[PDB]
Design a protein around this nucleic acid. Structure first.
Lengths: 81, 186, 210, 129, 149, 82
RNA sequence: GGAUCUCUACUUUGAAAAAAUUAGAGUGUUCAAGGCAGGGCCCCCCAUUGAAUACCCCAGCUAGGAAUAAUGGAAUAGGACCCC
């Protein structure tokens, strides 16, 4: 949100769920922001780069948290098809 | 015969040249008795993707089904006279404008569904791929208003039209102004 | 792991067949139907070992992403995975709850046994439902060795395997411990790991003395 | 029986959206639905959709972007003039900053903002925000 | 569901997408019309004619080999019956129920069905009068209906 | 099943589901060339014959009407066409 | 009250309409409720001194639009155009 003059008036921009584009509320304790490390092409060791994914509590409680991360890993070329 | 136009107009060099190839073919082939009773209305050559061109031989609607029985023979024989030119046979259907409340008329005859733009454009799409057959039809409405039609042809007869899918798109875009991509599902 | 060096070799698939990691019981969860290959004639569901390897490395990537290894919690309530998670915690450097998970360990701050990890790893989602449900009140992710008849109520990385069975569960904890160490600067990935998969196998008290 | 097929289309979208789905299949296809889904797509609420064309009413499969809160219809389909349009905006739209009321005017099926610029009224199909 | 009974069963035909005759069907439009005329003369309703052509002659759809439906083929030649087939079978059933109802007097189930059938007869005949298929003076009489079947 | 591809389903699901609930409805029936063991003429017979089909100008019976598909007589070989 | 064809209800404009009232423009009755008057210069003149404008359901009238919803057109054809 802006103030029609370039002034961002939102005190904090919440994280949207990487699986359902849902706003992760400040009191959504079941929410998860899991990091998935990236490996090297030639040796496959941890270099320091990782990928961030946020899944809200509703998707996680429903049981579609592992399928969402699986599809998100295939999109970022983490796990094989 | 060779060509019988509805009005008093006369064909040009190219339409007469195609008509000459039809009467010459019937004289020295087994298509003598079949090409004497049939004729064409027009024949327009258009360009396609790249440095290639194709022709569109128009046939009257009552003579369409009789033209399909010998199209598999006419296509192979006519493509020998024009090597790098594909041939198609699409009927000449008339599209009547829908009755509005401004065009002054007296006794318009209900404008049958066969003359609608939707029925004509779908009929043209069927005659354009006559060796194959439309098994399915999708409409990929993209993010903007521009859509894309996805025609699903038969798995059989694929080795005959696998190279004409580029010409079918150019012909259908020239006559109707629509984007069509052809697929062969199983 | 989609590269060429992150593909399982012949010696890895032989251990899965010897332990029984592909056998997945008679029941099937609708959330695990993508990890099962085909049901047998005796009702047993065969778990795809290739998809297990992909979820294993995906699980190992999240573990290495945790800077402090102590922030990883490895909970196993059943006796079949008690000594397996203890050797896993020592091989990596993570915490563990090998006994009975006291309710309120993650929520009751004034409690003596209070531990707030960054990544929870349970053996059986059904048998360890209390640590999973309690970890939902906090922002603690979950990596679970999920069988076919295992609910994914609070599972974030479901590892399809035969969680029940001494040789099966002990191998999975040994496989994950090796991949986590291989992704670090500890194992060369060319020489086989010195630790044998029999160190993670739970032994009944009747067979220990012999 | 199946009356007001536009209601069954937007109800299917609104439900599938809250379930977290990515694609929703609409059983009956209609030009009123396509004109409604195009306005929702031009403002960035739904993605692309393939009009599956069988030799019947036809089906549609719409992609969902997770940006839609609720899409519904106005069942009686009242006649909205250019003066009474402001009253419908306050009741249906959740805010004066977003949300649209899809109308049916002589210039075509469009939202309420475009009806103000073209200076024309008509009937009300529904809303989305 | 049904009109006069509960039940949401969907047991109907599923016509294919391809509106074309198969290549193995060599019967032309004239051959199919000759088969219909022979079958329509011997007292076969348009429903029964299409069944024989489908199961013995391979004619999957008479509408595809020809340009008209089975009833329009008979209506053009003049072999269509006076009253439609569906309305004829509803009256045929009502006479059979009423004949059973006058012998068995205390079968309240049959008396209940007679109201259901006669309700379908009046609404089906009402549709035919709007389409000018039946004369405006047409009326189903429970006494004189037995001579029409 | 949160993100399921509804446009390109596997042929195992389209073949399994009901003929009316498919993406594009298609009949589960077909036509066959029933060959009588005695004679040699080929007769196209619908799968669910629904009628007692016999050879034209003969005596042998080809099919029997049942609840679903027709029960062909013994020895009457057939082949489906497309 | 299903889908489907170029992709008289509805809608917009105009005409017409008692004022008062309501909304509202101008204006220091000492302010205000109100009024429709009154302001400026040394026998007048300037501010064409002002005394606006909006609203007036529905129905009727008029001119555009043609989406949406009804409705009609050729089937026992001499149906539409010609021929003449």
């Amino acid at each position: 949100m802006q103030n029609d003059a370039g002034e961002f008036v939102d005190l904090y921009v919440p994280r949207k769920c990487s699986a359902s584009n849902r706003i992760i509320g400040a009191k959504d304790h079941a929410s998860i922001q899991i990091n998935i490390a990236e490996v090297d092409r030639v040796t496959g060791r941890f270099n320091g780069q990782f990928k961030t994914y946020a899944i809200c509590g509703a998707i996680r409680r429903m049981g579609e948290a592992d399928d969402s991360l699986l599809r998100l890993a295939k999109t970022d070329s983490i796990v094989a098809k | 015969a060779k060509i019988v136009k509805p009005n008093g107009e006369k064909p040009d060099e190219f339409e007469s040249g195609i008509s000459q190839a039809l009467l010459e073919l019937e004289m020295n082939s087994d298509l003598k008795a079949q090409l004497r009773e049939l004729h064409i209305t027009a024949a327009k050559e258009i360009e396609v993707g790249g440095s290639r061109k194709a022709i569109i031989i128009f046939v009257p609607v009552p003579q369409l089904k009789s033209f399909q029985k010998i199209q598999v023979r006419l296509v192979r024989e006519l493509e020998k006279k024009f090597s790098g030119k594909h041939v198609v046979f699409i009927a000449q259907r008339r599209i009547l404008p829908k009755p509005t409340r401004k065009s002054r008329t007296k006794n318009k005859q209900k404008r049958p569904r066969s003359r609608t733009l939707t029925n004509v454009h779908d009929a043209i799409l069927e005659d354009l791929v006559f060796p194959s057959e439309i098994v399915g039809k999708r409409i990929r409405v993209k993010l903007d208003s521009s859509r894309l039609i996805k025609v699903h042809l038969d798995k059989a007869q694929q080795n005959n039209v696998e190279h004409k899918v580029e010409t079918f798109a150019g012909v259908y875009k020239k006559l109707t102004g629509k984007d069509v991509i052809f697929e062969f599902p199983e | 792991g989609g590269l060429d060096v992150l593909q399982m070799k012949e010696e890895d698939v032989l251990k899965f067949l010897a332990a029984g990691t592909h056998l997945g019981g008679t029941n099937l969860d609708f959330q695990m139907e993508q990890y099962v290959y085909k049901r047998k004639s005796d009702g047993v569901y065969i778990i795809n070992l290739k998809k297990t390897w992909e979820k294993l490395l995906l699980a190992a990537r999240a573990i290495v992403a945790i800077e402090n290894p102590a922030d990883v919690c490895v909970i196993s309530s059943r006796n079949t995975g008690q000594r397996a998670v203890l050797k896993f915690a020592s091989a990596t450097g993570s915490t563990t709850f090998a006994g009975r998970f006291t309710p309120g360990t993650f929520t009751n701050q004034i409690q003596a046994a209070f531990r707030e990890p960054r990544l929870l790893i349970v053996t059986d989602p059904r048998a360890d439902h209390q640590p999973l449900t309690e970890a939902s009140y906090v922002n603690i992710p979950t990596i679970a060795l999920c069988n076919t008849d295992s609910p994914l109520r609070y599972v974030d990385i479901a590892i399809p395997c035969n969680n029940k069975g001494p040789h099966s569960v002990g191998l999975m904890w040994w496989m994950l411990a090796r991949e986590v160490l291989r992704m670090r600067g500890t194992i060369s990935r060319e020489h086989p790991w010195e630790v044998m998969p029999d160190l993670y196998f739970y032994r009944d008290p009747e067979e220990i003395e012999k | 029986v199946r009356m007001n097929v536009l209601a069954d289309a937007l109800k299917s979208i609104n439900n599938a959206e809250k379930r977290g789905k990515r694609q929703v299949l609409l059983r009956p296809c209609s030009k009123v639905i396509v004109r409604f889904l195009t306005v929702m797509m031009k403002h960035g609420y739904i993605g692309e959709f393939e009009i599956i064309d069988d030799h019947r009413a036809g089906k549609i499969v719409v992609n969902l972007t997770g940006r839609l809160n609720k899409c519904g219809v106005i069942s009686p389909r009242f006649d909205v003039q250019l003066k009474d349009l402001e009253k419908w905006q306050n009741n249906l739209l959740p805010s004066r900053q977003f949300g649209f009321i899809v109308l049916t005017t002589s210039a075509g099926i469009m939202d309420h903002e475009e009806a103000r610029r073209k200076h024309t009224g008509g009937k009300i199909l529904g809303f989305f925000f | 569901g049904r009109m006069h009974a509960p039940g949401k069963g969907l047991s109907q035909s599923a016509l294919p997408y391809r509106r074309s005759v198969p290549t193995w069907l060599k019967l032309t439009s004239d051959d199919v019309k000759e088969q219909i005329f022979k079958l329509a003369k011997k007292g076969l309703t348009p429903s029964q004619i299409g069944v024989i052509l489908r199961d013995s002659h391979g004619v999957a759809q008479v509408r595809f080999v020809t340009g008209n439906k089975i009833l329009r083929i008979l209506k053009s030649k003049g072999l269509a019956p006076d009253l439609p087939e569906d309305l004829y079978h509803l009256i045929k059933k009502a006479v059979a129920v009423r004949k059973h109802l006058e012998r068995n007097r205390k079968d309240k189930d049959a008396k209940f069905r007679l109201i259901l059938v006669e309700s379908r007869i009046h609404r089906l005949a009402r549709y035919y009068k709007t389409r000018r298929v039946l004369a405006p003076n047409w009326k189903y009489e429970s006494s004189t209906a037995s001579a029409l079947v | 099943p949160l993100a399921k591809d509804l446009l390109h389903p596997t042929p195992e699901e389209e073949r399994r589901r009901h003929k009316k609930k498919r993406l594009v409805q298609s009949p589960n029936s077909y036509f066959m060339d029933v060959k009588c063991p005695g004679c040699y003429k080929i007769t196209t017979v619908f799968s669910h014959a629904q009628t007692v089909v016999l050879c034209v100008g003969c005596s042998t019976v080809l099919c029997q009407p049942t609840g679903g598909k027709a029960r062909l007589t013994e020895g009457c070989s057939f082949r489906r066409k497309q």
